[PDB]
RNA sequence: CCCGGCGAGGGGAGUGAAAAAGAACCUGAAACCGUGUACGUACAAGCAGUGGGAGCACGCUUAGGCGUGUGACUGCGUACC
RNA sequence: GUAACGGGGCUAAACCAUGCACCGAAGCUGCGGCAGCGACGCUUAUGCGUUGUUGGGUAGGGGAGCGUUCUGUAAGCCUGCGAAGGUGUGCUGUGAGGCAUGCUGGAGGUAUCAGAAGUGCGAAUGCUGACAUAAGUAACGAUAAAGCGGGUGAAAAGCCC
């Protein structure tokens, strides 16, 4: 805290409590007793534990019928209107789409839809698999996941 | 020299029970001009007992 | 249900006359205090005065056992530095005979505003005559 | 119908003004004016002006008759205090409060 | 427009959804200080409450004798860290 | 200042012996309720039928919770048909608390289950602001001194002549 280290007043003689610094945390405008510092909140996750969690999540999705497998999933042009119409036919509104190859046309179409996310087979994370109501995975995408999880 | 305890608002009110002012019982009326005035005092217009004392 | 409580504005008080000639001071006083407090009534309530009015006659003829007639001393302080004054039982009887019974009964009654109120119902006379005939006191052989 | 007149931020402590106010509480306006005229207090001048203003408000705004008016309510409230410094001996400083007050007068035809 | 010292400060009028948003201006707590109403209080002694408890006022009620405020009198009772 | 029964008073209301009653505590019993620990019915994804027993507490150890701000759940849900905050009332739990609602207020608030803490104040001759008390009391700063007429002004002991 900006200020001088001078004693505000002498130790004895005045009828006031002891003071040694104007920056004492007791005083107004003083420093914070345990002032915070920037810190890293990341935690370690064992490789096997992380892989085990993904397998449990995927199994639960199949149990709850929240996982849908399709032969292919693509759009003709990078237009949001086409993708939105496609999802209406399949009765999907909040879905996560995983594809083996991240087609640029599909990626651009889904950009403006905040309830739709397009991810690569290697880009799946545990939170995403749970956050979205439904998960759509292509047949080739299903194959890729198997070796990653083994 | 100084108090050892803070007196209460009740004690403050009790001490002030004798501080009330007293209003004049009544005002005299001049026999000639008819204006009210303090008894044994000249009126604002300079009258006293209907004699028209100096009013310069 | 709640226990019954006497009401100060609906309590019945009677009048009695007692002759103190030849009666022991202390034993007479206890009975007077008991009746002034209303302890003899089934409607007795500690915070209500349910006693009776008592008239005491011949207060100057009370009796005391032993040598108390000349040895019992009544002390009282006037509030000044000298203050301490005393009078024997014989002196009190000669000067203020009524005070002898009055003092004894007062010490036997509860202390406080209610106890003071109880004492107001006791009438003590040195002679054998009283002027409370209008109240029709009933003879009490106590 | 009751008419209100106020004098806010008057230069006088509420305690001093309250002494005069209690003299005219509940009195007829004509009688109240006479009492204030012959009261040798500074607060009397302040209170009289408020009472006169209340009477004037009744005629102009409410169309009332003065002969029927009386001081139904009157009270004095503490106002903001002005802080000042008064030097004392041996270099000590003291705080001086210049207290003010709000004067309210209500006149009604009741 | 009115009172006032061609004041200060107010009362109307008008503006605005709101002026108890009027510039000492969003919301406007507490200490502290007032006005009004109900009840208690001028023969009574102490950590001021607690248990009991009359009377009075008031809101109820198919008189339902309960609720709310006050607390004469009485048992016990010497704050906190 | 009685002052060597607490008091009044007591010739028993004192003392010794014997006997029978009664008063007397948060002790014991009766009635209702809560919780801890044991064994039992192998009951039970465990609560009981029960069943005994325990429950003063500083330093201190162990166990289980309330509420506050913030992140996800939440582009959800509540809200100008009135949010947060302020102020009353009623109801409710063993407690920290919770729920509903009148008035004020005039735009934000947030379930559930998880996550992170600048997370709870009466005291430290604590810190800052506000306001009390003494009190309408002391004091108004050299005891060189003022009186009157007129003027001005809403108002003159203090200004002008």
From Swiss-Prot, chain D:
Effect of residue 93 to S/T/V: Abolishes translation elongation arrest of SecM
Keyword RNA-binding: yes
Pfam family, one: Ribosomal_L22
SUPFAM superfamilies cross-referenced by the UniProt entry: Ribosomal protein L22 (SSF54843)
A GO molecular function held by the record: large ribosomal subunit rRNA binding
One cellular component (GO) term of this entry: cytoplasm
GO BP terms: assembly of large subunit precursor of preribosome; cytoplasmic translation; cytosolic ribosome assembly; response to antibiotic; ribosome assembly; translation
Entry keyword set: Antibiotic resistance, Ribonucleoprotein, Ribosomal protein, RNA-binding, rRNA-binding
Miscellaneous information on this protein: The wild-type allele (erythromycin sensitive) is dominant over the resistant allele, and is also dominant over the temperature-sensitive allele at both low and high temperatures.
Family statement: Belongs to the universal ribosomal protein uL22 family.
HAMAP family: Ribosomal_uL22_B (MF_01331_B)
Function: This protein binds specifically to 23S rRNA; its binding is stimulated by other ribosomal proteins, e.g. uL4, bL17, and bL20. It is important during the early stages of 50S assembly. It makes multiple contacts with different domains of the 23S rRNA in the assembled 50S subunit and ribosome. The globular domain of the protein is one of the proteins that surrounds the polypeptide exit tunnel on the outside of the subunit, while an extended beta-hairpin is found that penetrates into the center of the 70S ribosome where it lines the wall of the exit tunnel. Removal of most of this hairpin (residues 85-95) does not prevent its incorporation into 70S ribosomes. Two of the hairpin residues (Gly-91 and Ala-93) seem to be involved in translation elongation arrest of the SecM protein, as their replacement by larger amino acids alleviates the arrest.
This protein's name: Large ribosomal subunit protein uL22
Originating organism: Escherichia coli (strain K12)
This protein's encoding gene: rplV
């Amino acid at each position: 805290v900006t200020g001088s280290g001078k004693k505000p007043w002498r130790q004895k003689g005045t009828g006031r409590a002891r003071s040694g610094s104007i920056k004492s945390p007791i005083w107004r405008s003083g420093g914070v007793t345990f002032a915070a510092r920037p810190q890293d909140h990341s935690q370690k996750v064992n490789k096997k534990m992380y892989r085990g969690a993904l397998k449990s999540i995927l199994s639960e999705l199949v149990r709850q019928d929240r996982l849908i497998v399709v032969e292919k999933f693509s759009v003709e042009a990078p237009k949001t209107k086409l993708l939105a119409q496609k999802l209406k036919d399949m009765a999907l509104e909040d879905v996560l789409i995983i594809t083996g190859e991240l087609d640029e046309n599909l990626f651009l179409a889904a950009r403006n839809l905040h309830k739709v996310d397009v991810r690569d087979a290697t880009g799946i994370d545990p939170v995403s698999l749970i956050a979205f109501d439904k998960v759509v995975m292509t047949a080739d995408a299903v194959k890729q996941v198997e070796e990653m999880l083994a | 020299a100084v108090q050892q305890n803070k007196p209460t608002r009740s004690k403050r009110g009790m001490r002030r029970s004798h501080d009330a002012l007293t209003a004049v019982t009544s005002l005299s009326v001049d026999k000639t001009s008819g204006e009210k005035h303090l008894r044994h005092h000249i009126t604002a217009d300079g009258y006293y007992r209907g004699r028209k004392v100096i009013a310069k | 249900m709640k226990t019954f409580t006497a009401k100060p504005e609906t309590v019945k008080r009677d009048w009695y006359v007692v002759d103190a000639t030849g009666k022991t001071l202390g034993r007479l006083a206890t009975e007077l205090a008991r009746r002034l407090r209303g302890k003899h009534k089934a409607e007795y309530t500690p915070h209500v005065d349910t006693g009776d009015y008592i008239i005491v006659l011949n207060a100057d003829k009370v009796a005391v056992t032993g040598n108390k007639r000349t040895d019992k001393v009544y002390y009282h302080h006037t509030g000044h530095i000298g203050g301490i004054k005393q009078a024997t039982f014989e002196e009190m009887i000669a000067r203020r005979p009524e005070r002898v019974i009055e003092i004894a009964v007062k010490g036997m009654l509860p202390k406080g505003p209610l106890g003071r109120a109880m004492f107001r119902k006791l009438k003590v006379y040195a002679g054998n005559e009283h002027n409370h005939a209008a109240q029709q006191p009933q003879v009490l052989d106590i | 119908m009751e008419t209100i007149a106020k004098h806010r931020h008057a230069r006088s402590s509420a305690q001093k003004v309250r002494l005069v106010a209690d003299l005219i509480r509940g009195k007829k306006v004509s009688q109240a004016l006479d009492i204030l005229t012959y009261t040798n207090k500074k607060a009397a001048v302040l209170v009289k002006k408020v009472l006169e203003s209340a009477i004037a408000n009744a005629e102009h705004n409410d169309g009332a008759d003065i002969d029927d008016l009386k001081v139904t309510k009157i009270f004095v409230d503490e106002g903001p205090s002005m802080k000042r410094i008064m030097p004392r001996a041996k270099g000590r400083a003291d705080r001086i409060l210049k207290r003010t007050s709000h004067i309210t007068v209500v006149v009604s035809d009741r």
